[PDB]
C-alpha cells in the first residue's frame, strides 16, 4: 500500500506519532517521505547485510528478525515482513521503541538529513487531522 501523505499523517496520528517524543507529526511525515515514499512495502538491503523494512525503513539487526541478518537482536520482537503490512500499527509500535533508544529521531538517516531542522509542518498542509 502507498499512503496518501495526509493518509498517512491520520494514521501516524491516531497511533499516538504526533508529539511521540517530542517529534511533532510533520518529522514523522518527513521521515516516511524519504525513507518509504510512503510504501509500506519498501525493503532495502544495507552494506552490513542487514536490511531496512517498511513505511519507516526499520533495520533487521537491530530491531525485526528477517532470518537472514548477523547478529540480529530482533529488540521490537516481530517478522521483518509484519513490518510490511497495509496497516501500520507494527510499524509504529517499533518506531516507538527506536525513537526511544536515545538518539532519538537520528535513527532514520534520512530525517537526520533530509527532514531534520526544516519545515516539517509543511508535511501536514492542507490535511484535516
Ligand atoms: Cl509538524
Ligand atoms: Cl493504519
Ligand atoms: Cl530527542
Request: with cysteine; net charge neutral; proline share 2%.
Given at each position: 500500500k502507498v499512503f496518501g501523505r495526509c493518509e498517512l499523517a491520520a494514521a501516524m496520528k491516531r497511533h499516538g506519532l504526533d508529539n511521540y517524543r517530542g517529534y511533532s507529526l510533520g518529522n514523522?511525515?518527513?521521515?516516511?517521505?524519504?525513507?518509504?515514499?510512503?510504501?509500506?512495502?519498501?525493503?532495502?538491503?544495507?552494506?552490513?547485510?542487514?536490511?531496512?523494512?517498511?513505511?519507516?525503513?526499520?533495520?533487521?539487526?537491530?530491531?525485526?528478525?528477517?532470518?537472514?541478518?548477523?547478529?540480529?537482536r530482533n529488540l521490537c520482537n516481530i517478522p521483518c515482513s509484519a513490518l510490511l503490512s497495509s496497516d501500520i500499527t507494527a510499524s509504529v509500535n517499533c518506531a516507538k521503541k527506536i525513537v526511544s533508544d536515545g538518539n532519538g529521531m537520528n535513527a532514520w538517516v534520512a530525517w537526520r538529513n533530509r527532514c531534520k531542522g526544516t519545515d516539517v509542518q509543511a508535511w501536514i498542509r492542507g490535511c484535516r487531522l
Open positions: 514523522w511525515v518527513c521521515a516516511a517521505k524519504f525513507e518509504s515514499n510512503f510504501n509500506t512495502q519498501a525493503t532495502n538491503r544495507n552494506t552490513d547485510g542487514s536490511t531496512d523494512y517498511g513505511i519507516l525503513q526499520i533495520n533487521s539487526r537491530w530491531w525485526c528478525n528477517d532470518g537472514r541478518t548477523p547478529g540480529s
